[PDB]
Design a protein around this motif. Structure first.
Motif, PDB file in Angstrom:
ATOM      1  N   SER C   7       0.870  -1.202   0.000  1.00  0.00           N
ATOM      2  CA  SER C   7       0.000   0.000   0.000  1.00  0.00           C
ATOM      3  C   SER C   7       0.895   1.236   0.000  1.00  0.00           C
ATOM      4  N   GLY C   8       0.297   2.422   0.069  1.00  0.00           N
ATOM      5  CA  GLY C   8       1.093   3.661   0.115  1.00  0.00           C
ATOM      6  C   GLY C   8       1.620   4.048  -1.252  1.00  0.00           C
ATOM      7  N   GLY C   9       0.965   3.589  -2.320  1.00  0.00           N
ATOM      8  CA  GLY C   9       1.388   3.990  -3.674  1.00  0.00           C
ATOM      9  C   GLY C   9       0.734   5.280  -4.128  1.00  0.00           C
ATOM     10  N   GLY C  10       1.522   6.351  -4.259  1.00  0.00           N
ATOM     11  CA  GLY C  10       0.989   7.645  -4.725  1.00  0.00           C
ATOM     12  C   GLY C  10       2.070   8.525  -5.320  1.00  0.00           C
ATOM     13  N   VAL C  11       1.682   9.535  -6.103  1.00  0.00           N
ATOM     14  CA  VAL C  11       2.671  10.499  -6.668  1.00  0.00           C
ATOM     15  C   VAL C  11       3.244  11.349  -5.529  1.00  0.00           C
ATOM     16  N   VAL C  12       4.563  11.555  -5.517  1.00  0.00           N
ATOM     17  CA  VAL C  12       5.221  12.384  -4.463  1.00  0.00           C
ATOM     18  C   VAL C  12       6.137  13.401  -5.146  1.00  0.00           C
ATOM     19  N   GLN C  13       6.147  14.649  -4.674  1.00  0.00           N
ATOM     20  CA  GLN C  13       7.068  15.678  -5.227  1.00  0.00           C
ATOM     21  C   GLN C  13       8.503  15.343  -4.800  1.00  0.00           C
ATOM     22  N   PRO C  14       9.576  15.706  -5.556  1.00  0.00           N
ATOM     23  CA  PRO C  14      10.955  15.470  -5.101  1.00  0.00           C
ATOM     24  C   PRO C  14      11.312  16.199  -3.799  1.00  0.00           C
ATOM     25  N   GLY C  15      12.081  15.543  -2.925  1.00  0.00           N
ATOM     26  CA  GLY C  15      12.465  16.148  -1.635  1.00  0.00           C
ATOM     27  C   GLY C  15      11.370  15.971  -0.600  1.00  0.00           C
ATOM     28  N   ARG C  16      10.298  15.260  -0.962  1.00  0.00           N
ATOM     29  CA  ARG C  16       9.172  15.009  -0.023  1.00  0.00           C
ATOM     30  C   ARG C  16       9.161  13.515   0.300  1.00  0.00           C
ATOM     31  N   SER C  17       8.849  13.150   1.541  1.00  0.00           N
ATOM     32  CA  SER C  17       8.960  11.725   1.938  1.00  0.00           C
ATOM     33  C   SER C  17       7.589  11.088   2.141  1.00  0.00           C
ATOM     34  N   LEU C  18       7.362   9.907   1.560  1.00  0.00           N
ATOM     35  CA  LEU C  18       6.097   9.175   1.826  1.00  0.00           C
ATOM     36  C   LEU C  18       6.456   7.819   2.426  1.00  0.00           C
ATOM     37  N   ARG C  19       5.888   7.484   3.579  1.00  0.00           N
ATOM     38  CA  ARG C  19       6.133   6.130   4.129  1.00  0.00           C
ATOM     39  C   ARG C  19       5.448   5.128   3.207  1.00  0.00           C
ATOM     40  N   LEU C  20       6.130   4.034   2.873  1.00  0.00           N
ATOM     41  CA  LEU C  20       5.497   2.977   2.049  1.00  0.00           C
ATOM     42  C   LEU C  20       5.238   1.809   2.993  1.00  0.00           C
ATOM     43  N   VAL C  79       6.315  -4.112   7.234  1.00  0.00           N
ATOM     44  CA  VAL C  79       7.677  -3.526   7.074  1.00  0.00           C
ATOM     45  C   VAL C  79       7.457  -2.147   6.472  1.00  0.00           C
ATOM     46  N   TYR C  80       8.079  -1.123   7.039  1.00  0.00           N
ATOM     47  CA  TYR C  80       7.804   0.251   6.561  1.00  0.00           C
ATOM     48  C   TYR C  80       9.061   0.841   5.941  1.00  0.00           C
ATOM     49  N   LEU C  81       8.971   1.354   4.720  1.00  0.00           N
ATOM     50  CA  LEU C  81      10.155   2.049   4.165  1.00  0.00           C
ATOM     51  C   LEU C  81       9.763   3.494   3.906  1.00  0.00           C
ATOM     52  N   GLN C  82      10.541   4.454   4.402  1.00  0.00           N
ATOM     53  CA  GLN C  82      10.265   5.874   4.064  1.00  0.00           C
ATOM     54  C   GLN C  82      11.550   6.486   3.511  1.00  0.00           C
ATOM     55  N   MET C  83      11.458   7.216   2.403  1.00  0.00           N
ATOM     56  CA  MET C  83      12.693   7.764   1.788  1.00  0.00           C
ATOM     57  C   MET C  83      12.717   9.258   2.085  1.00  0.00           C
ATOM     58  N   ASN C  84      13.767   9.741   2.745  1.00  0.00           N
ATOM     59  CA  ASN C  84      13.777  11.162   3.177  1.00  0.00           C
ATOM     60  C   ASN C  84      13.688  12.078   1.957  1.00  0.00           C
ATOM     61  N   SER C  85      14.470  11.794   0.917  1.00  0.00           N
ATOM     62  CA  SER C  85      14.381  12.603  -0.322  1.00  0.00           C
ATOM     63  C   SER C  85      14.231  11.668  -1.519  1.00  0.00           C
ATOM     64  N   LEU C  86      13.227  11.910  -2.359  1.00  0.00           N
ATOM     65  CA  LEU C  86      12.989  11.017  -3.519  1.00  0.00           C
ATOM     66  C   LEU C  86      13.526  11.706  -4.773  1.00  0.00           C
ATOM     67  N   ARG C  87      14.493  11.078  -5.443  1.00  0.00           N
ATOM     68  CA  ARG C  87      15.047  11.653  -6.694  1.00  0.00           C
ATOM     69  C   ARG C  87      14.057  11.455  -7.844  1.00  0.00           C
ATOM     70  N   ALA C  88      14.158  12.288  -8.882  1.00  0.00           N
ATOM     71  CA  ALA C  88      13.280  12.152 -10.065  1.00  0.00           C
ATOM     72  C   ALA C  88      13.526  10.777 -10.684  1.00  0.00           C
ATOM     73  N   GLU C  89      14.764  10.289 -10.611  1.00  0.00           N
ATOM     74  CA  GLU C  89      15.120   8.968 -11.188  1.00  0.00           C
ATOM     75  C   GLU C  89      14.291   7.870 -10.516  1.00  0.00           C
ATOM     76  N   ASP C  90      14.026   7.981  -9.214  1.00  0.00           N
ATOM     77  CA  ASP C  90      13.331   6.874  -8.507  1.00  0.00           C
ATOM     78  C   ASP C  90      11.818   6.962  -8.724  1.00  0.00           C
ATOM     79  N   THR C  91      11.345   6.723  -9.949  1.00  0.00           N
ATOM     80  CA  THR C  91       9.894   6.769 -10.272  1.00  0.00           C
ATOM     81  C   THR C  91       9.418   5.329 -10.382  1.00  0.00           C
ATOM     82  N   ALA C  92      10.159   4.403  -9.790  1.00  0.00           N
ATOM     83  CA  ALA C  92       9.888   2.960  -9.975  1.00  0.00           C
ATOM     84  C   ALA C  92       8.651   2.427  -9.267  1.00  0.00           C
ATOM     85  N   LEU C  93       8.252   1.212  -9.624  1.00  0.00           N
ATOM     86  CA  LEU C  93       7.161   0.558  -8.881  1.00  0.00           C
ATOM     87  C   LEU C  93       7.849  -0.218  -7.763  1.00  0.00           C
TER      88      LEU C  93
END
Lengths: 50, 106, 122
Positions: C7-20, C79-93
């Motif tokens: 779950s937790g699949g959504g569009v996120v702006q770069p430099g913004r963190s979403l817990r997955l 298991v929770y993964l949160q990325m502090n800053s998301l690069r434009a490159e990391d647009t993966a599933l």
């Protein structure tokens, strides 16, 4: 005829041979209780010996 | 840490035997895994430890090798079993995956 | 029965963190290790971070370092993964993987997950 060793047999009841029922299958059975050894607590455990 | 899979595209008709090879920079000692990501779904693991089939759902996908060379030779390929094949080491923790081989139709 | 729905699949702006949140079902979450594998669109599977059985062991991929916190709450079963800053490159599933690979019993990446279509946009 072979039992009397002759090609001619006189009237009567003769004990020619014996009849035996033969076993259909083979069954092996051992106790249900597992009596499981504690290999589980040695092979996998949170920590191992140095 | 570096794995390269040589046959990037292979086209095989039904019953063709297709062999796919990926080799490693350092010895991985029988610790390699091959997966088959069908387009539009997540991958499924097809072989673990280089020589053992897994859950057994795959039956003809024999693969073999030790140390540097591991190759996955599909036998009587059916048209359904066409999908990219990817390989990764499973025991050195900086794990990596190879580019992939697509068994497309002719 | 066995599943690792995510779950937790959504569009996120770069430099913004979403817990997955990678939920678990039909498994003993504590013994099984969990790690995260990401496939950028039109590319191949890549690897990120790993959490052990105790939740005491964390190792990270060289490409992104210290940019994500992977945590396994056994009681939560998630298991929770949160990325502090998301690069434009990391647009993966992002994909969640279950690995029983140090116990004289198991093999790697056995089930895998349906996945969440993370997105980086601007």
């Amino acid at each position: 005829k072979c039992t009397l060793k002759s090609f001619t047999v006189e009237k009567g009841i003769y004990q020619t041979s014996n009849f035996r029922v033969q076993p259909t299958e083979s069954i092996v059975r051992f106790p249900n209780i597992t009596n499981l050894c504690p290999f589980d607590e040695v092979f996998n455990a949170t920590r191992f010996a140095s | 840490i570096v794995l390269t899979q040589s046959p990037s595209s292979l086209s095989a008709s039904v019953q063709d035997r297709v062999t796919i090879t990926c080799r490693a920079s350092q010895v991985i000692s029988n610790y390699l895994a091959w997966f088959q990501q069908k387009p539009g779904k997540a991958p499924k693991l097809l072989i673990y430890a280089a020589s053992n089939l897994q859950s057994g759902v795959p039956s003809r996908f024999r693969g073999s090798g030790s140390g540097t060379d591991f190759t996955l030779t599909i036998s009587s390929l059916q048209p359904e079993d066409f999908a990219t094949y990817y390989c990764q080491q499973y025991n050195i923790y900086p794990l990596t995956f190879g580019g992939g081989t697509k068994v497309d139709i002719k | 029965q066995v599943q690792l729905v995510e779950s937790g699949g959504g569009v996120v702006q770069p430099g913004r963190s979403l817990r997955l949140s990678c939920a678990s079902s039909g498994f003993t979450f504590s013994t099984y290790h969990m790690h995260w594998v990401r496939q950028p669109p039109g590319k191949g599977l890549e690897w990120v971070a790993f959490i052990s059985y105790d939740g005491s062991n964390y190792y990270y991929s060289d490409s992104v370092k210290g940019r994500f916190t992977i945590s396994r709450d056994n009681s939560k079963n998630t298991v929770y993964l949160q990325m502090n800053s998301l690069r434009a490159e990391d647009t993966a599933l992002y994909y969640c993987a279950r690995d029983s690979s140090g116990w004289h019993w198991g093999v790697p990446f056995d089930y895998w997950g349906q996945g969440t279509l993370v997105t980086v946009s601007s």
